[PDB]
């Protein structure tokens, strides 16, 4: 199968309940760590019998409830939320924001976890070659951290190709973040996850949207047989459905760690959406 | 698949819940705009995983409720209703008018949306060759705007072949409208939509009519297997089930815009049905 | 498929809910009108998507309720009942009369309409060649209209081969009516119709008879699969399940119309059953 | 198919709800009448669409109720019961007698009729060749009608091979009755009939026996699919499930009618079971 | 098929609801009677249509309820219980005794009879060759009937190879009993029988054991398809599921009958289990 | 099939409800006893018809309830618990400890037994060759039994390769225990066992984990068909689901029994987890 342990993760663009243009979390990025059924040196893989099943239901009354429900499946190592406008750039976040602004409707989220294995590390890492070259191309200073830098977060949001930004090294940092993300996965439950977002008026007016992680694309969620077939494809193509991450700056040389931290704050502000 | 972004739309003859002689909205017209998975220049296409599902139910007590339920799926850009006797020339509108005039029955509408992708433009357009030639054959003045013109809207409704009309340029404008419509689609959700119209007496007397948009013709709506097969055919032949339009006069030269607006008002009165 | 627009109809022997010896209304007669997906000149055919479904239920307390339930599906143009002992010569009429005479039971009728298309004319007709020859062989006077004619209606009911009738021209008229019926179809909804007649005692004593119009012969009404298969055969062999007729004398030369009206009154009296 | 109109019938050994050693009424005998979809001369055959279904339930508190439930399906022409110890020699009669003698149980009978056609005669008959030869072998006198005849009904019940009977012509008459029965079918509803005899104690102690008429042997009555398959085989092998009979002595020469009537009374007493 | 009429039966080791090491009653022994669809001389076989079905349920509060439920299916001719520690040596008897000793649980038994035919004799029998030779090797006296005989029933239970027993002829008699049983079947209903023994605590703590007679070994009792397949194998391999027996001493020469009765009492005490 | 009678058993690492890395109890070890459908000399094998089914449900409020529910299926001969930190080193034990520490959730365990046969011994054994060689390599004294020995249980838990332990003979004893376990199976019920561990919050928040013993790996527990297929594979690969064990020291020479008992107490403390 595919290894997602050590994969990069964009906490701003990620969404652990899914996206209609991806079969997994859209924040998952190419692998960042390099490793050595089979156990990776320094970590572990524990395979399940069939699928470890779990289900959740939550009434999402505001944006904070949706944020908390996403943070349950994509948090810092230990369970603390990533924050920093996490998930706010994803489509599902914007869709739910539009639906929750309507006070005449109430939305619930139902998660169905079909877990197939667990993997993790415990801590002297070696990174991938692509990540190493990318880091070697990074400067030691983040230009937008300087007060009165012409390239501010709004300037990047409005026009990143303006002269105010193209003269600084900000596009290099943002290209790195766009390539590898802001965090990396240190622990994960992989398999399939089928989540239903159900919106009810105040007429039995009810709407139901289906969001899927893992397996092959399912033809019909209402079909029982197609659902079972999707569950059969989950065994073949499992993908992370609940994971914990560590910040990427722990993997950079210290002379770039502070500038990278400033770069990810800048990125979280320019790409992320404050509730406005 | 087939591109419907920029397709013409007759707001008078259209019906966004369907027509028994069409697999889609009977008002959709051949493409009016020309464009350049793949993204059209100036717009966007966002593909879904499987089907984005949604369901609605509404009690239709009068003609205005039906107008509102159709306007939900076929409106001006921004969500405002098209109005101007919209949908009033379609078969479904006349059938429902006949059913709602009977005060001894109550009718409900259940929509089932099976959406596969979204497309749109944001605004320097280029039109199709057929639309350009059609516009080049149009005059600069609409004759029926002149007061005391022998060719009025009622005269066209009674006999459009009469001398009062064949001497004016009105038939040219109406042939253009009959070819390309009155608006054009600027944003759309495409796929399938199965709508049930259920009429109950005041005896468990209940009638149910099925209207379908998108996919291949379904053999049996009561059959579960035939319904699932139709859902499988929606992936192959998706069609607009909820869209937003802009008036066509924005695409004509400025010297013809006023005459075209007068022509579409004339058309809305002569072909459209006021509640009488 | 087969064209039933303009088909003859015997309103006395007809029965729009079916017959165990026919797959359609036993009163339907060979085509009377000649015509020119495809639209017949002077009329229209409107094809449905799948099946337009409808269901009815009625408690039949007496013969008049059954007469009204049949008249709903076989009426004059406009909805008025045909009458004139309509349907009274059909088998189902006699069966239900026998069941309703028993005051210790109560019978209900459940109709299930599976309509596939609608057809009609609007009015200069030409008839078929067989109908033209039949009319050319008709006299201008109906002998039984003369007072004290030896050939009365009951005399025809008892023995039509008696000398009292074989000397008059009545057998010619009755042969014509027996060939083409008394009316002809001017509007029709065709497809399939499954009607259940359920008789309950006053012990859960219940009897259920099934009567079918349209499609191929169904093997088992209780089998779900065989019922679905019948619904699939309705698409192939659709037959009129709800129609409106016009009297046949409108199609005869004026010199024969009065004698034909007298002939159909005589026929309705001799063949039809008054509730005795 | 097989014609049962005019078949002989042993009213003593018959049982219209069935027998496990026969697929039909065990009292049906070879055809007695000879005849000429197709209509037999002197009678009628009326075919149904699919199956005319009917269902009954009755609580059988004593032997008279069971006698009445059987007589409904095998009666004299007009509906009057055959009587004369009818059905009393059949196995099902003896089984039910054993069960109804137990006052600690209560038995119910549920009939399910799946009728496919009706046939009948109206009255100059010709009998079959076998029946004619059998009658020609009959004497004009029945010996056991003579008072103090050594061959009585009890003597026949004890030992029919005793000298008291073999010297008289009683064995000839009883051989004729054993070959052709005592009545013959003049009207019949043929098809399938599944009857359940359900006995409840006074613990939810319930016993259910299945008795089947018509069609092919069904594999499993509790299986839904095997039941449907049996219903499909009923179309192929329909058998009388509700019929009306006339005494056989109407078909014999007048000089033998009285002796045959005495022979059938003798047979009903010697073979039939009075409730002792 | 296999004939079980006249088969020997060990009433001590038998169990008519089944055994996990046998497909039938573990007490059935090789055939003892010799006989001559086809009818055996002196007896009868009555074949059923499909399966004569029956169901029973009983709450087994103590050992006597279980004894009565087994005696229903294996009794003396006429319905009287065999007694004499009948069934007490079988495994199922010991299992249920262990479960009924626990007063914190309650056990119910559900029988499902699938009967295919009935057979019996009515009474000059001839036995099989093996049974005749076995009887010819028997003495005329049973040694353990002599008072104070060193070989008692308890001594046989403790050690049958001790000098106290091997000097007497008791091992010969017990070898005969071990070969042919203690009774023989004179009437039987054969087919399949699925019995569920359900034990409930006093938590929805429930245990269910399945015991089967007849047919082929079933793969899964909870599977509907495997159950139906077992029912189809019952048609191929029917076995006695409810029978009536007569003591074997009626088949021995009179000089050996009394010694055989003493031998079967001895066997019932030494092998049977009194409720201790 | 495979013999598990006489297999070694590690009571510390075992878990009789399963493990996601094993198809059976993870404590089962290679066979320790050597033996001679077929009956092993000194023991017995009793095969069932299909599956002996049983089900249990228990609310697990604390670690002791889980310990008791596991001890039901893996106990000393007679039913007494093994104790000595039994099961505490298994993955399932640690997972349940983590879940029961959360006082905001309540966990239930549902067992489903599908038993296929029972085996046992009654007591002069000969052991396997591997076990005999392993015992011959054992010393007669356990070094860690000496007070103030540098190699204690905590030292073994922290670092077993330290000089404090590698100088003593403790690694030899622990290698023997790691190979053959601490007990061996003397009685067993083998087949399949599907256990559900269901955790409920205090929102219908519910989680369900599936643990399986026996048969082939099941693809999907929620699929009915995959569950039935697993039940079909249990017949092919039955494994112990409820067994009773005896301590291994009964199989060692008397001069090594005390040192082995000290070695297994040492192992139970060093590898086992006390509730801290
Ligand atoms: C990768 O890192 C691991 C430590 O996690 C180390 O053991 C290994 O040697 C490293 N890879 C190489 C090629 O040295
Ligand atoms: C059509 O218009 C688009 C703007 O949306 C433009 O990019 C494109 O070049 C035009 N077509 C051609 C052939 O130039
Ligand atoms: C039949 O009638 C139509 C109009 O109803 C007419 O156009 C046509 O000419 C007629 N048929 C022939 C053969 O002329
Ligand atoms: C049989 O009887 C019919 C009348 O029921 C008669 O028409 C026919 O001639 C008879 N058969 C023969 C061979 O004559
Ligand atoms: C078997 O017994 C029957 C009577 O039960 C008898 O007629 C027959 O002769 C016996 N068999 C032989 C071989 O004699
Ligand atoms: C092992 O012991 C069995 C009895 O349990 C004995 O029959 C057998 O001979 C021994 N093994 C060998 C290889 O002899």
Numbering used by the authors:
A (entry chain C), B (entry chain D), C (entry chain E), D (entry chain F), E (entry chain G), F (entry chain A): 465 to 500, 514 to 600, 605 to 683, 727 to 800
Give the original sentences from the paper that presented this experimental model.
Escape from the PV, and therefore from the infected cell, for subsequent rounds of infection has been shown to be dependent on the perforin-like protein TgPLP1 (T. gondii PLP). The MACPF domain forms hexameric assemblies, with ring and helix geometries, and the APCβ domain has a novel β-prism fold joined to the MACPF domain by a short linker.
We first obtained oligomeric crystal forms of the TgPLP1 MACPF domain by the use of in situ trypsinization in crystallization drops. On solution of the resulting structures, we found two related assemblies: a ring-shaped hexamer and a helical packing arrangement with six subunits per turn. By contrast, however, the ring-form oligomer crystal structure is imperfect with three main-chain hydrogen bonds being found between only two of the subunit interfaces (“A-B” and “D-E”). Together with the low resolution of the structure, which was only subject to rigid-body refinement, this suggests that the ring-form crystal structure may not represent a functional biological assembly although it may represent an assembly intermediate. In the crystal structures, all subunit interfaces in the helical assembly are identical, but the ring oligomer has three different interfaces, with three, one, and no main-chain hydrogen bonds, respectively, in contrast to the six in each of the helical subunit interfaces.
